[PDB]
Amino acid sequence: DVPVNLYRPNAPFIGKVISNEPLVKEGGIGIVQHIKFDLTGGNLKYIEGQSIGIIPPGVDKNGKPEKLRLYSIASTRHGDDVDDKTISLCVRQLEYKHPESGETVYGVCSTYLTHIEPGSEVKITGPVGKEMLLPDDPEANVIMLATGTGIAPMRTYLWRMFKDAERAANPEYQFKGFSWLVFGVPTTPNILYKEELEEIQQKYPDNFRLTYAISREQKNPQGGRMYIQDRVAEHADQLWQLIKNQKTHTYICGLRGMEEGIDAALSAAAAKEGVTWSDYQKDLKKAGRWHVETS
Numbered sequence: 001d002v003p004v005n006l007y008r009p010n011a012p013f014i015g016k017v018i019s020n021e022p023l024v025k026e027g028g029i030g031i032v033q034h035i036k037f038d039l040t041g042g043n044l045k046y047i048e049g050q051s052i053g054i055i056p057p058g059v060d061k062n063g064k065p066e067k068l069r070l071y072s073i074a075s076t077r078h079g080d081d082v083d084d085k086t087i088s089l090c091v092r093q094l095e096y097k098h099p100e101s102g103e104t105v106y107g108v109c110s111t112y113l114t115h116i117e118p119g120s121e122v123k124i125t126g127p128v129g130k131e132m133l134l135p136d137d138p139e140a141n142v143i144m145l146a147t148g149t150g151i152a153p154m155r156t157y158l159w160r161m162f163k164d165a166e167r168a169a170n171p172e173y174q175f176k177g178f179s180w181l182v183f184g185v186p187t188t189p190n191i192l193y194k195e196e197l198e199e200i201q202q203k204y205p206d207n208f209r210l211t212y213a214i215s216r217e218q219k220n221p222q223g224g225r226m227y228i229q230d231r232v233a234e235h236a237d238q239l240w241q242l243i244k245n246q247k248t249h250t251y252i253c254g255l256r257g258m259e260e261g262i263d264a265a266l267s268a269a270a271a272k273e274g275v276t277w278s279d280y281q282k283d284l285k286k287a288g289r290w291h292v293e294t295s
Ligand SMILES: Cc1cc2nc3c(=O)[nH]c(=O)nc-3n(C[C@H](O)[C@H](O)[C@H](O)COP(=O)(O)OP(=O)(O)OC[C@H]3O[C@@H](n4cnc5c(N)ncnc54)[C@H](O)[C@@H]3O)c2cc1C
Pocket: 051, 069, 070, 071, 072, 073, 090, 091, 092, 093, 094, 096, 106, 107, 108, 109, 110, 111, 149, 150, 152, 293, 295
C-alpha cells in the first residue's frame, strides 16, 4: 500500500515550483530553503519518511547529463496546505572551500534548488524509501534524533501527529503516544522550523518533548561545543528506558558521524541492566523499529 517509484529518471514528473522560502534566520550559518512543488497534472503520491529525486539541468565536468539527487520529503502526504496537491523539500546549499586554495565550491543540485524561482519546472522522481516509515499505531512512541536537514523526515512525522489540519484530515491517526525530538544545529537562527516546533511542544507538553543541541551557544560537560551526541549522553537512561517499550520506534537522520557517540551512550545505559546495546539494536533493526538515514 506504500507508494513507490511512481515516476522514474527516464520519464520524470515535471512539477512546478510554488514557493522557495528561507529557513535560516538572520545570523545563522549557511542557506537552507523550504521549497514547495505543485503535483497537479500527475499522480505522484507519497507518505511520511520517504524521499524524492530531483534531476538538475546541465552536464557534469565530463559532459554527461547530471543524475538525480535524493531529498527527504519535508511535507506530510497531504502537503503543507493539506490539500494533497503539493510536496516540499528542506534543501541546504552545499558550499565548501576547495582544499589548499581559496575558491569556494557550490553543489550542483542543491544550488540549483536553493536559487530556483517560483513557476520554474522541475524534474521529479519517486517516491523512494521504506526505511523511515512511521507506524500506524497511534500509541507508539517516537524518538527522533536529527541534525540540520535531517529534520526533514521528522517534520513529516510531527506535522501528521500534531497539526490541527492533519488530525482533522486523518481520522485514523490521532496520535496519543510520546514523541521526542533531539535536534542539533549550530545556532538558534539555524533551528529549522523553530516557531512551529515550539508551538507543538507548548500545545502537547505530554506528547512531545523538544531538546536542542546548539554548538555555538552551548557547551557540553567537558567544555566542548554541544552536539547531539552530548544530549543523548545526557539523557541516555531516559532514552534507553523508552527504547525498551515494544512499541517505541527511533529515527535517525543527519548524524553522519554522530551515530557512534549515540551508541556509546545507549550502550552504557543498557549495560546497567545487563543488556548489550549492539545486540539489542540489531534486533530492533530486524523488527523495523530502529530507522536510520544518514548521508
Ligand atoms: C536519502 C537521502 C536523503 C537526502 N535528503 C537531503 C535533504 O533533505 N536535504 C539536503 O540538503 N540534502 C539531502 N540529501 C543530500 C543530497 O542528495 C545531495 O547529495 C546534496 O544536496 C548535495 O548535492 P549537490 O548536487 O548539491 O552537490 P554535488 O554537485 O553532487 O557535489 C557533492 C560532492 O561534493 C563533494 N563534497 C561535499 N562536501 C565536501 C567537503 N566538505 N570537502 C570536500 N568535498 C566535498 C563530495 O564529493 C560530494 O559527493 C539526501 C541524500 C540522500 C541519499
